[PDB]
Design an enzyme around this catalytic site. Structure first.
Site, PDB file in Angstrom:
ATOM      1  N   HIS A  83       0.838  -1.194   0.000  1.00  0.00           N
ATOM      2  CA  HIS A  83       0.000   0.000   0.000  1.00  0.00           C
ATOM      3  C   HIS A  83       0.885   1.261   0.000  1.00  0.00           C
ATOM      4  O   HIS A  83       2.088   1.186   0.255  1.00  0.00           O
ATOM      5  CB  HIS A  83      -0.997  -0.009   1.155  1.00  0.00           C
ATOM      6  CG  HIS A  83      -0.373   0.195   2.491  1.00  0.00           C
ATOM      7  ND1 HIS A  83       0.370  -0.780   3.118  1.00  0.00           N
ATOM      8  CD2 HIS A  83      -0.363   1.259   3.319  1.00  0.00           C
ATOM      9  CE1 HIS A  83       0.786  -0.330   4.288  1.00  0.00           C
ATOM     10  NE2 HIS A  83       0.376   0.912   4.426  1.00  0.00           N
ATOM     11  N   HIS A  85       1.409   4.106   1.694  1.00  0.00           N
ATOM     12  CA  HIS A  85       1.601   4.998   2.850  1.00  0.00           C
ATOM     13  C   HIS A  85       3.098   5.273   3.043  1.00  0.00           C
ATOM     14  O   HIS A  85       3.964   4.451   2.630  1.00  0.00           O
ATOM     15  CB  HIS A  85       0.979   4.408   4.134  1.00  0.00           C
ATOM     16  CG  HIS A  85      -0.494   4.673   4.295  1.00  0.00           C
ATOM     17  ND1 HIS A  85      -1.251   4.082   5.291  1.00  0.00           N
ATOM     18  CD2 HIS A  85      -1.349   5.471   3.599  1.00  0.00           C
ATOM     19  CE1 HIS A  85      -2.507   4.491   5.187  1.00  0.00           C
ATOM     20  NE2 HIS A  85      -2.596   5.331   4.159  1.00  0.00           N
ATOM     21  N   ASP A  87       5.071   4.966   5.605  1.00  0.00           N
ATOM     22  CA  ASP A  87       5.833   3.953   6.327  1.00  0.00           C
ATOM     23  C   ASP A  87       6.082   2.670   5.577  1.00  0.00           C
ATOM     24  O   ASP A  87       6.778   1.801   6.102  1.00  0.00           O
ATOM     25  CB  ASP A  87       5.258   3.628   7.703  1.00  0.00           C
ATOM     26  CG  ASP A  87       3.732   3.521   7.756  1.00  0.00           C
ATOM     27  OD1 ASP A  87       3.034   3.507   6.739  1.00  0.00           O
ATOM     28  OD2 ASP A  87       3.243   3.442   8.884  1.00  0.00           O
ATOM     29  N   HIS A  88       5.589   2.555   4.352  1.00  0.00           N
ATOM     30  CA  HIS A  88       5.919   1.397   3.534  1.00  0.00           C
ATOM     31  C   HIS A  88       6.377   1.727   2.132  1.00  0.00           C
ATOM     32  O   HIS A  88       7.159   0.960   1.550  1.00  0.00           O
ATOM     33  CB  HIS A  88       4.735   0.461   3.572  1.00  0.00           C
ATOM     34  CG  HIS A  88       4.410   0.028   4.965  1.00  0.00           C
ATOM     35  ND1 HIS A  88       5.230  -0.817   5.682  1.00  0.00           N
ATOM     36  CD2 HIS A  88       3.438   0.428   5.818  1.00  0.00           C
ATOM     37  CE1 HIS A  88       4.753  -0.943   6.910  1.00  0.00           C
ATOM     38  NE2 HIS A  88       3.659  -0.213   7.009  1.00  0.00           N
ATOM     39  N   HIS A 159      -7.511  -1.071   4.215  1.00  0.00           N
ATOM     40  CA  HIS A 159      -6.471  -0.338   4.896  1.00  0.00           C
ATOM     41  C   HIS A 159      -6.108   0.889   4.059  1.00  0.00           C
ATOM     42  O   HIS A 159      -5.986   2.023   4.598  1.00  0.00           O
ATOM     43  CB  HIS A 159      -5.272  -1.242   5.198  1.00  0.00           C
ATOM     44  CG  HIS A 159      -4.162  -0.552   5.942  1.00  0.00           C
ATOM     45  ND1 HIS A 159      -4.272  -0.154   7.261  1.00  0.00           N
ATOM     46  CD2 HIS A 159      -2.900  -0.248   5.567  1.00  0.00           C
ATOM     47  CE1 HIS A 159      -3.139   0.414   7.646  1.00  0.00           C
ATOM     48  NE2 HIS A 159      -2.283   0.345   6.644  1.00  0.00           N
ATOM     49  N   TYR A 190      -9.759   4.774  11.937  1.00  0.00           N
ATOM     50  CA  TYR A 190     -10.624   5.086  10.828  1.00  0.00           C
ATOM     51  C   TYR A 190     -12.060   5.192  11.289  1.00  0.00           C
ATOM     52  O   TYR A 190     -12.507   4.392  12.104  1.00  0.00           O
ATOM     53  CB  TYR A 190     -10.589   3.982   9.780  1.00  0.00           C
ATOM     54  CG  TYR A 190      -9.312   3.806   9.009  1.00  0.00           C
ATOM     55  CD1 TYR A 190      -8.140   4.501   9.334  1.00  0.00           C
ATOM     56  CD2 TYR A 190      -9.269   2.886   7.951  1.00  0.00           C
ATOM     57  CE1 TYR A 190      -6.987   4.306   8.614  1.00  0.00           C
ATOM     58  CE2 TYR A 190      -8.111   2.685   7.236  1.00  0.00           C
ATOM     59  CZ  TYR A 190      -6.961   3.386   7.568  1.00  0.00           C
ATOM     60  OH  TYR A 190      -5.792   3.171   6.838  1.00  0.00           O
ATOM     61  N   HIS A 224       4.236  -4.723   8.606  1.00  0.00           N
ATOM     62  CA  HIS A 224       4.704  -4.758   9.991  1.00  0.00           C
ATOM     63  C   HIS A 224       4.800  -6.248  10.378  1.00  0.00           C
ATOM     64  O   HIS A 224       3.793  -6.959  10.361  1.00  0.00           O
ATOM     65  CB  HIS A 224       3.744  -4.020  10.936  1.00  0.00           C
ATOM     66  CG  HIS A 224       3.771  -2.532  10.773  1.00  0.00           C
ATOM     67  ND1 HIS A 224       4.846  -1.769  11.178  1.00  0.00           N
ATOM     68  CD2 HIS A 224       2.900  -1.678  10.172  1.00  0.00           C
ATOM     69  CE1 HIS A 224       4.615  -0.504  10.855  1.00  0.00           C
ATOM     70  NE2 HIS A 224       3.438  -0.424  10.254  1.00  0.00           N
TER      71      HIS A 224
END
Length: 266
Positions: A83, A85, A87-88, A159, A190, A224
């Site tokens: 995805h 975001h 952090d990835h 997500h 969310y 994660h």
């Protein structure tokens, strides 16, 4: 006096930023990111593939780990994303600048990536990162083959709209290992019900639980590691406690149903 607040940097737990040496998952597949962020290197006789890169500041680390594996900047052909975001997908733009890598992604992930994660459906501009362009748009169930590793995209919206599980078959001990790299199936803070920006959020999550539970899945990995009970710091036992896709999906769904209840209460 009072001024507007300063911009807040997207700050994270130290373990998310802790470098580790390559950890081998199967004959061609290595974890090369940090202790708490997944970045998968798949090395083949016809180039390398990277699935996720973690946070924006991890680019140089990933590149160092690639070199430790024999993978040079020209060797890196393809970046895939769970995805888009911060952090990835954080370092994707920089990696594209410093390597021959091209990004393949679905329309949703491509648009989010092209805006550096700004105007997030849930987080607004709290998690921006350097934007990048996708070179190839993929459809649900589409296959990309690099050096005879065949990656299949399984959309699992929720997500993020563009969340994807990528599956492939590697080997260990001459036997096939069907690897599933599935996105998060959390919905952290969310608004689930009647969200104007995502009207069918709930229906998508439910379909995504069913998608994930049915994946070809001898080994599950998640962006994660903790979400699939991987422990990247545990060496020869790193993957020992890993969940099945079935278990991972069941847990996610039970948590989602509890989150719905709390939302109605709140």
């Amino acid at each position: 006096e009072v001024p507007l607040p300063q911009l807040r940097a997207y700050t994270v737990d130290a373990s998310w930023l802790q470098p580790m040496a390559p950890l081998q998952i199967a004959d061609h597949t290595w974890q090369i990111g940090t202790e708490d962020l997944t970045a998968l290197l798949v090395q083949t006789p016809d180039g390398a593939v990277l699935l996720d890169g973690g946070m924006p500041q991890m680019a140089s680390h990933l590149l160092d780990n690639m070199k430790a594996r024999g993978v040079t900047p020209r060797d890196l052909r393809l970046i895939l994303l769970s995805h888009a975001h911060a952090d990835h997908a954080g370092p994707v733009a920089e990696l594209k600048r410093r390597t021959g890598a091209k990004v393949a992604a679905n329309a949703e992930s491509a648009v989010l990536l092209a805006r550096g994660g700004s105007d997030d459906l849930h987080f607004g501009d709290g998690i921006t990162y350097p934007p990048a362009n996708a070179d190839r748009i993929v459809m649900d169930g589409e296959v990309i083959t690099v050096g005879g590793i065949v990656f299949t995209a399984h959309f699992m919206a929720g997500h993020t709209p563009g969340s994807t599980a990528w599956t492939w078959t590697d080997t260990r001990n001459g036997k096939p290992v069907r690897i599933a790299y599935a996105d998060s199936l959390s919905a952290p803070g969310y608004q689930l019900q009647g969200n104007p920006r995502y009207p069918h959020l709930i229906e998508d999550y439910r379909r995504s639980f069913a998608t994930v539970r049915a994946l070809p899945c001898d080994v599950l990995l998640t962006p994660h590691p903790g979400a699939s009970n991987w422990d990247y710091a545990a060496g020869a036992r790193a993957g020992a406690k890993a969940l099945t896709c079935k278990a991972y999906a069941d847990a996610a769904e039970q948590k989602f149903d509890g989150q719905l209840a709390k939302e109605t209460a709140g």
